[PDB]
A paper describes a structure:
To gain insight into the evolution and designability of ligand binding and specificity, we analyzed the homologous PBPs, PotF and PotD, which are Escherichia coli putrescine (PUT)-binding protein and spermidine (SPD)-binding protein, respectively. They constitute the first elements of two separate multicomponent uptake systems (PotFGHI and PotABCD) to transport the cationic polyamines PUT and SPD across the cellular membrane. Still, the protein-binding modes differ: PotF shows affinity for PUT and SPD, whereas PotD exclusively binds SPD. Prior to this work, we grafted the seven differences in amino acids from PotD binding pocket onto PotF; this resulted in PotF_SPD, which will be referred to as PotF/D throughout this work to keep naming for mutants more concise.
We introduced the S247D exchange into PotF/D and into our high-affinity constructs E39D–Y87S–F88Y and E39D–F88A/L. The combination of S247D with the other constructs led to an affinity improvement with which the nanomolar range was reached for the first time, while keeping the order of affinities in the different mutants the same compared with the prior analysis. Nonetheless, all constructs regained PUT affinity in the medium to low micromolar range. All structures but PotF/D–S247D adopt a fully closed wildtype conformation. PotF/D–E39D–Y87S–F88Y–S247D is the construct with the highest SPD affinity (840 nM). In this structure, Y88 is stacking with N65 and the salt bridge residue R91, stabilizing the latter and thereby adopting the fully closed conformation. Furthermore, the hydroxyl group of Y88 is coordinated by E66, whereas R91 is interacting with S87 in two alternate conformations. Taken together, the interplay of the mentioned residues forms a tight pocket surrounding Y88, thereby stabilizing the distal region and supporting the completely closed conformation. In all constructs that carry S247D, SPD adopts a “relaxed” conformation and does not show unexpected bending of its backbone to fit a specific position as it does when being bound by PotF wildtype or PotF/D. On the other hand, we designed a PotF/D construct that completely switched its ligand preference compared with the wildtype by exhibiting nanomolar affinity for SPD (840 nM) and medium micromolar affinity for PUT (88 μM).
Author numbering: 29 to 375
Write the structure that this text describes.
């Protein structure tokens, strides 16, 4: 009797995927969840995670490759590997050369989730919902404060978005960009931000408790769908803003010390079945990386340009770079200062 341990993002599988795999294979699954790349990386670098499969973003897989925390995937144990789109594989390979360590899972963008009606009530019918101005212009956040503003608790995402908005390289390697203009803007915004959190914003958007959030696309579409299902009269939408946004792939990987590799390959091959991953996309409102699955994904998901954006929008997307340790120090210190920003001092 074997037991497979999986560590995935919250809100990132269909409700019946694991039970269906358990029923089919007889394998018992222990499924645990996270909402932060930094939490997962800390576990991978601190000791044994005890997990057989983990799901980093691709730039987090990249940065940990030479640490040897992952073992290469034996493709002979993944006969359904050919269902993955081979062009998407080439893009993922920028982070994982020759696709040796990672199985692409889902792809999306980091944009703005918002309450359509409350934004228009507060900012007017002309509210700049197609722009990062909605959430990064202080004059707008000051007005939105009471209806509730959330930022992701993701320093890399937040600084890269701010840098881009300020007309800098979103992956700037210049320390002064972080300590100066990016920090200046974030401190100006900070009094109007209710919280930094990377998962509470889904239900808060759905229930009308947060009016604007920096959010991951399919999480915001899940909020929208939860409100629709609740018949609660809340209208949530998502914007990939006109100034561009971050795009990313999340990938399954196998820790080098995984106990139950055979069961792990069984689960990956299960996810490679087109019906399995299409059903996941239908529930989580994210694009998968499986070419064979695409015709099976629901029309509502496939036809949503905030899930499958067209070429003119894709042209404005950027990807995360791994920063050197001096930028990492500057950025992380600045993030701690920003998040503590409301506190009173006596110096
Ligand atoms: C099936 O995933 C949606 C397609 O993803 C779009 C991004 C990842 O690719 C860019 C290239 C140009 N197509
Ligand atoms: Cl990524
Ligand atoms: Cl359909």
């Amino acid at each position: 009797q074997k037991t497979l341990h999986i560590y995935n993002w919250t809100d990132y599988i269909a409700p019946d995927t694991v039970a269906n795999f358990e029923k089919e294979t007889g394998i018992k699954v222990v499924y645990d969840v996270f909402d932060s790349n930094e939490v997962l990386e800390g576990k991978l670098m601190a000791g044994s995670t005890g997990f057989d499969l983990v799901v980093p973003s691709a730039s987090y897989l990249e940065r940990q490759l030479t640490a040897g925390v992952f073992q290469p995937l034996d493709k002979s144990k993944l006969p359904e590997w050919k269902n993955l789109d081979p062009e998407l594989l080439k893009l993922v390979a920028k982070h994982d050369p020759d696709n040796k360590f990672a199985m692409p899972y889902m792809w999306a963008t980091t944009g703005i989730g918002y309450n359509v009606d409350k934004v228009k009530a507060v900012l007017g019918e002309n509210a700049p919902v197609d722009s990062w101005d909605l959430i990064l212009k202080p004059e707008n956040l000051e007005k939105l404060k009471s209806c509730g503003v959330s930022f992701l608790d993701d320093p890399e995402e937040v600084f890269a978005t701010v840098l881009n908005y300020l007309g800098k390289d979103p992956n700037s390697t210049k320390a002064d960009d972080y300590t100066g203009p990016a920090t200046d803007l974030l401190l100006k915004l900070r009094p109007n931000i209710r919280y930094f959190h990377s998962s509470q914003y889904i239900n808060d958007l759905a229930n009308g408790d947060i009016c604007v959030a920096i959010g991951w696309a399919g999480d915001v579409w899940q909020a929208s769908n939860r409100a629709k299902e609740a018949k609660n009269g809340v209208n949530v939408s998502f914007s990939i803003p006109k100034e561009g946004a971050m795009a990313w792939f999340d990938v399954f990987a196998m820790p080098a010390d995984a106990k139950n590799k055979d069961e792990a390959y069984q689960f990956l091959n299960y996810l490679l079945r087109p019906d399995v991953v299409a059903h996941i996309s239908d529930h989580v409102f994210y694009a998968n990386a499986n070419k064979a699955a695409t015709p099976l994904v629901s029309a509502e998901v496939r036809e949503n340009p905030g899930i499958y954006p067209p070429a003119d929008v894709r042209a404005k997307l950027f990807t995360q770079k791994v920063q050197d340790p001096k930028i990492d120090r500057v950025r992380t210190r600045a993030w701690t200062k920003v998040k503590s920003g409301k506190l009173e001092h006596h110096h």
